[PDB]
Amino acid sequence: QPIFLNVLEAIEPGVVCAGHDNNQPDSFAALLSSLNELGERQLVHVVKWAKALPGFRNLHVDDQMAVIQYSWMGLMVFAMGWRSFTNVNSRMLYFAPDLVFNEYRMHKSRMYSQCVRMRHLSQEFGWLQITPQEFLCMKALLLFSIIPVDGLKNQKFFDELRMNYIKELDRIIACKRKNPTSCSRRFYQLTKLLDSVQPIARELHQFTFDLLIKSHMVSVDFPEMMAEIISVQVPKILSGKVKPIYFHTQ
Ligand SMILES: C[C@@H](Cc1ccc(O)c(O)c1)[C@@H](C)Cc1ccc(O)c(O)c1
Ligand SMILES: C[C@]12CC[C@H]3[C@@H](CCC4=CC(=O)CC[C@@]43C)[C@@H]1CC[C@@H]2O
């Protein structure tokens, strides 16, 4: 029995609802305030999920919050892609059971191009035939894929942790496979899939950072936690002080 898989499967967070009043007209201001409240909500879970991950509390405490604060975009975008694939075969974006974006919501949110990228992503789960086991280990690996260029408080611990999550993903690929040509191709495939989250996550950082700046102008509410992470932590990403870790050069 794989102990590592039992844990991921057990800690996976349940459905989270956005709180969106679906009887309102689909306006930019309402779509985004709801995506924003959706972020606050998802964030509470992400924190609880990350803390229960095997080895996570071995990281220094300031590094525990830094990694969560750097990587939430990618992790949530990925999860959402998976929810989109499993529920509606990647036809729409399944943000929350109460906030499914049709083509029209995509246009009204004014992120049609990001949503188009987010949708290609969700389709990849289908095209690549990702298993829930692979999905889960990839998502944990995503929590460890962005860090300051000066390094963390205890960079050593982090590197150990992340090396292990790499092995586990490699373990879940090998656990039922014939010859090592396909084990290779698959690991290549999934590593490229993970890389692909980063540019998408970078576009959303830019977007939401812009959005918060003119939040008052455009009538868009940001909950406190979202306000603080976007104004404190996102700018370090955008200014190049915090960078994603790619498996392959872009
Ligand atoms: C994810 C873990 C990998 C793992 C642990 C136990 C298992 O039975 C397994 O199959 C894989 C990883 C964290 C190993 C580890 C052990 C001890 C630690 O202190 C630490 O930071 C990390
Ligand atoms: C950041 C954001 C709210 C949080 C959104 C994000 C789009 C991606 C996303 C996917 C989810 O499933 C949870 C909400 C999040 C994480 C939105 C883009 C602009 C808006 O400000």
Coordinates of C-alpha atoms and ligand atoms in Angstrom, one line a residue:
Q1 CA 0.0 0.0 0.0
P2 CA 1.4 3.5 -0.9
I3 CA 1.3 5.5 2.3
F4 CA 2.0 8.7 0.3
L5 CA -1.1 8.3 -1.9
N6 CA -3.3 7.6 1.1
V7 CA -2.4 11.0 2.5
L8 CA -3.0 13.1 -0.6
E9 CA -6.2 11.3 -1.4
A10 CA -7.3 11.9 2.3
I11 CA -6.4 15.6 2.5
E12 CA -7.8 16.7 -0.9
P13 CA -10.3 19.5 -0.1
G14 CA -13.9 19.2 -1.0
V15 CA -16.2 21.3 -3.1
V16 CA -16.0 25.1 -2.3
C17 CA -18.8 27.4 -3.5
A18 CA -18.2 30.9 -4.7
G19 CA -21.3 32.7 -3.1
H20 CA -22.2 34.1 -6.6
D21 CA -25.7 35.6 -7.0
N22 CA -26.5 33.9 -10.3
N23 CA -29.7 35.9 -10.9
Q24 CA -27.7 39.1 -11.5
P25 CA -26.7 40.0 -15.0
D26 CA -23.2 38.8 -15.9
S27 CA -21.2 42.0 -15.3
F28 CA -17.4 42.5 -15.1
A29 CA -17.8 43.8 -11.5
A30 CA -20.0 40.9 -10.3
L31 CA -18.0 38.1 -12.0
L32 CA -14.8 39.4 -10.5
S33 CA -16.0 40.2 -7.0
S34 CA -17.2 36.6 -7.0
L35 CA -14.0 35.2 -8.4
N36 CA -12.3 37.2 -5.6
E37 CA -14.5 35.9 -2.8
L38 CA -13.9 32.5 -4.3
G39 CA -10.1 33.1 -3.9
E40 CA -10.5 34.0 -0.2
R41 CA -12.5 30.9 0.4
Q42 CA -10.2 28.6 -1.6
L43 CA -7.2 30.0 0.3
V44 CA -8.5 28.9 3.7
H45 CA -8.5 25.3 2.4
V46 CA -5.2 25.6 0.6
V47 CA -3.6 26.6 3.9
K48 CA -5.2 23.6 5.7
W49 CA -4.3 21.3 2.9
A50 CA -0.6 22.4 2.6
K51 CA 0.0 22.1 6.4
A52 CA -1.2 18.4 6.3
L53 CA 1.1 17.5 3.4
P54 CA 3.8 14.9 4.3
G55 CA 7.0 16.8 5.4
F56 CA 5.5 20.3 5.1
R57 CA 5.9 21.2 8.7
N58 CA 9.5 20.3 8.5
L59 CA 10.0 23.5 6.6
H60 CA 10.7 26.6 8.6
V61 CA 7.6 28.4 9.6
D62 CA 8.1 31.6 7.6
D63 CA 8.9 29.5 4.6
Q64 CA 5.6 27.6 5.1
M65 CA 3.6 30.8 4.5
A66 CA 5.9 32.1 1.8
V67 CA 5.4 29.1 -0.4
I68 CA 1.7 29.2 0.0
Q69 CA 1.6 32.9 -0.6
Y70 CA 3.7 32.5 -3.8
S71 CA 2.1 29.5 -5.3
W72 CA -1.7 29.7 -4.7
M73 CA -2.5 30.9 -8.2
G74 CA -0.9 28.0 -9.9
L75 CA -2.3 25.5 -7.5
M76 CA -5.9 26.8 -7.8
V77 CA -5.7 27.2 -11.5
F78 CA -4.6 23.5 -11.8
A79 CA -7.3 22.3 -9.4
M80 CA -9.9 24.2 -11.4
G81 CA -8.6 22.7 -14.6
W82 CA -9.1 19.3 -13.2
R83 CA -12.7 20.2 -11.9
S84 CA -13.4 21.4 -15.4
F85 CA -12.3 18.2 -17.0
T86 CA -14.0 15.8 -14.6
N87 CA -17.4 17.7 -14.5
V88 CA -18.0 19.2 -17.9
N89 CA -15.3 17.6 -20.1
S90 CA -13.5 21.0 -20.4
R91 CA -16.4 22.7 -22.3
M92 CA -16.6 25.6 -19.8
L93 CA -14.6 26.7 -16.8
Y94 CA -15.9 25.1 -13.6
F95 CA -14.7 27.7 -11.0
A96 CA -17.2 26.7 -8.4
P97 CA -20.6 24.7 -8.7
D98 CA -22.3 28.1 -8.5
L99 CA -19.8 29.9 -11.0
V100 CA -19.4 28.1 -14.2
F101 CA -18.1 30.3 -17.0
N102 CA -19.7 30.0 -20.4
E103 CA -18.2 31.8 -23.4
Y104 CA -20.2 34.8 -22.5
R105 CA -18.9 35.0 -18.9
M106 CA -15.4 34.6 -20.4
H107 CA -16.0 37.7 -22.5
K108 CA -17.7 39.7 -19.7
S109 CA -14.9 38.9 -17.1
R110 CA -12.6 40.5 -19.7
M111 CA -10.2 37.6 -19.4
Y112 CA -11.2 35.8 -22.5
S113 CA -7.5 35.1 -23.5
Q114 CA -6.5 33.8 -20.0
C115 CA -9.7 31.7 -19.8
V116 CA -8.8 30.3 -23.3
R117 CA -5.3 29.3 -21.9
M118 CA -7.0 27.9 -18.7
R119 CA -9.3 25.9 -20.9
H120 CA -6.5 24.4 -23.1
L121 CA -4.9 23.4 -19.8
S122 CA -8.1 21.6 -18.6
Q123 CA -8.3 19.8 -22.0
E124 CA -4.7 18.6 -21.5
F125 CA -5.9 16.3 -18.6
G126 CA -8.1 14.6 -21.1
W127 CA -5.6 14.6 -24.0
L128 CA -2.9 13.3 -21.6
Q129 CA -5.3 10.9 -19.8
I130 CA -4.1 12.0 -16.4
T131 CA -5.1 9.8 -13.5
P132 CA -6.3 11.2 -10.1
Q133 CA -3.1 9.8 -8.6
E134 CA -0.9 11.8 -11.1
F135 CA -3.1 14.8 -10.6
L136 CA -2.7 14.8 -6.8
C137 CA 1.1 14.4 -6.8
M138 CA 1.4 17.0 -9.5
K139 CA -0.7 19.4 -7.5
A140 CA 1.5 18.9 -4.4
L141 CA 4.6 19.4 -6.6
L142 CA 3.0 22.7 -7.7
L143 CA 3.2 24.0 -4.1
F144 CA 7.0 23.6 -4.4
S145 CA 7.5 25.3 -7.8
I146 CA 8.0 29.0 -7.0
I147 CA 10.6 30.6 -4.7
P148 CA 12.6 33.9 -4.2
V149 CA 15.9 34.1 -6.1
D150 CA 17.7 34.8 -2.8
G151 CA 16.3 31.5 -1.6
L152 CA 14.2 30.6 1.4
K153 CA 15.1 31.0 5.2
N154 CA 16.0 27.3 5.1
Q155 CA 16.6 26.5 1.4
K156 CA 18.1 23.1 2.3
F157 CA 14.9 21.7 3.7
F158 CA 13.0 22.9 0.7
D159 CA 15.2 21.2 -1.8
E160 CA 15.0 17.9 0.1
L161 CA 11.2 18.2 0.3
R162 CA 10.8 19.0 -3.4
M163 CA 13.3 16.3 -4.6
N164 CA 11.0 13.8 -2.7
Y165 CA 7.8 15.0 -4.3
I166 CA 9.6 14.5 -7.6
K167 CA 10.4 10.9 -6.7
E168 CA 6.9 10.3 -5.7
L169 CA 5.5 11.5 -9.0
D170 CA 8.1 9.3 -10.7
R171 CA 7.0 6.5 -8.3
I172 CA 3.3 6.8 -9.3
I173 CA 4.3 6.7 -12.9
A174 CA 6.3 3.5 -12.6
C175 CA 3.9 1.5 -10.3
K176 CA 2.1 0.0 -13.3
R177 CA 4.2 0.2 -16.5
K178 CA 5.9 -2.2 -19.0
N179 CA 9.1 -0.9 -20.6
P180 CA 11.1 2.3 -19.5
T181 CA 10.5 4.1 -23.0
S182 CA 6.9 5.0 -21.8
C183 CA 7.9 5.8 -18.2
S184 CA 10.3 8.3 -19.8
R185 CA 7.8 9.8 -22.2
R186 CA 5.2 10.1 -19.5
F187 CA 7.5 11.8 -17.0
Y188 CA 8.5 14.1 -19.9
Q189 CA 4.8 14.7 -20.7
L190 CA 3.8 15.5 -17.1
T191 CA 6.8 17.7 -16.4
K192 CA 5.9 19.7 -19.4
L193 CA 2.3 19.9 -18.2
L194 CA 3.5 21.3 -14.9
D195 CA 5.7 23.9 -16.5
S196 CA 2.8 25.0 -18.6
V197 CA 0.9 26.2 -15.4
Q198 CA 3.5 28.9 -14.7
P199 CA 2.9 31.3 -17.7
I200 CA -0.8 31.1 -17.2
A201 CA -0.3 31.8 -13.5
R202 CA 1.9 34.7 -14.5
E203 CA -0.8 36.2 -16.7
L204 CA -3.3 36.0 -13.8
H205 CA -0.9 37.7 -11.5
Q206 CA -0.5 40.6 -13.9
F207 CA -4.3 40.8 -14.5
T208 CA -5.4 40.7 -10.8
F209 CA -2.6 43.0 -9.7
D210 CA -3.8 45.5 -12.4
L211 CA -7.4 44.9 -11.2
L212 CA -6.7 45.6 -7.6
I213 CA -4.9 48.9 -8.5
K214 CA -8.1 50.3 -10.1
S215 CA -10.5 48.3 -7.8
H216 CA -12.2 51.6 -6.7
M217 CA -12.6 52.9 -10.3
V218 CA -14.3 49.8 -11.5
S219 CA -16.4 48.7 -8.4
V220 CA -14.6 45.4 -7.7
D221 CA -14.3 44.2 -4.1
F222 CA -11.2 42.3 -2.9
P223 CA -11.5 40.5 0.4
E224 CA -8.8 41.3 3.0
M225 CA -6.5 38.3 2.4
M226 CA -6.7 38.6 -1.4
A227 CA -6.0 42.3 -1.0
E228 CA -2.9 41.8 1.1
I229 CA -1.4 38.9 -0.9
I230 CA -1.9 40.7 -4.1
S231 CA -0.4 43.9 -2.9
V232 CA 2.5 42.4 -0.9
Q233 CA 3.4 39.0 -2.5
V234 CA 2.3 39.2 -6.1
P235 CA 4.5 42.3 -6.8
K236 CA 7.6 40.3 -5.8
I237 CA 6.7 37.8 -8.5
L238 CA 5.9 40.5 -11.0
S239 CA 9.2 42.4 -10.2
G240 CA 11.2 39.2 -10.6
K241 CA 12.2 38.7 -7.0
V242 CA 10.3 35.5 -6.7
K243 CA 10.5 33.1 -9.7
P244 CA 8.9 29.8 -10.7
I245 CA 11.0 26.6 -11.0
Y246 CA 10.8 25.2 -14.4
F247 CA 11.7 21.6 -15.2
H248 CA 12.7 22.8 -18.8
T249 CA 14.0 26.1 -20.0
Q250 CA 11.2 28.2 -21.5
Ligands
LIG1 C1 6.9 13.1 1.0 C2 7.8 12.2 1.8 C3 8.1 10.9 0.9 C4 7.6 9.6 1.5 C5 7.6 9.4 2.9 C6 7.1 8.2 3.5 C7 6.8 7.2 2.6 O1 6.3 6.0 3.2 C8 6.9 7.3 1.2 O2 6.5 6.3 0.3 C9 7.3 8.6 0.7 C10 9.0 13.0 2.2 C11 8.6 14.2 3.0 C12 10.1 12.2 2.9 C13 10.5 12.9 4.2 C14 10.7 12.2 5.3 C15 11.1 12.9 6.5 C16 11.2 14.3 6.5 O3 11.5 14.9 7.7 C17 10.9 15.0 5.3 O4 10.9 16.4 5.3 C18 10.5 14.3 4.1
LIG2 C1 -7.3 36.3 -9.0 C2 -8.8 36.2 -9.4 C3 -9.6 35.6 -8.3 C4 -9.0 34.2 -7.9 C5 -9.2 33.3 -9.1 C6 -8.4 33.8 -10.3 C7 -8.6 33.0 -11.6 C8 -8.1 31.5 -11.3 C9 -8.8 31.0 -10.0 C10 -9.3 29.7 -10.1 C11 -10.1 29.1 -9.0 O1 -10.6 28.0 -9.1 C12 -10.2 29.9 -7.7 C13 -10.2 31.4 -8.0 C14 -9.0 31.8 -8.8 C15 -7.7 31.6 -8.0 C16 -8.9 35.3 -10.6 C17 -8.2 36.0 -11.8 C18 -8.5 37.5 -11.4 C19 -9.2 37.5 -10.0 O2 -8.7 38.7 -9.3

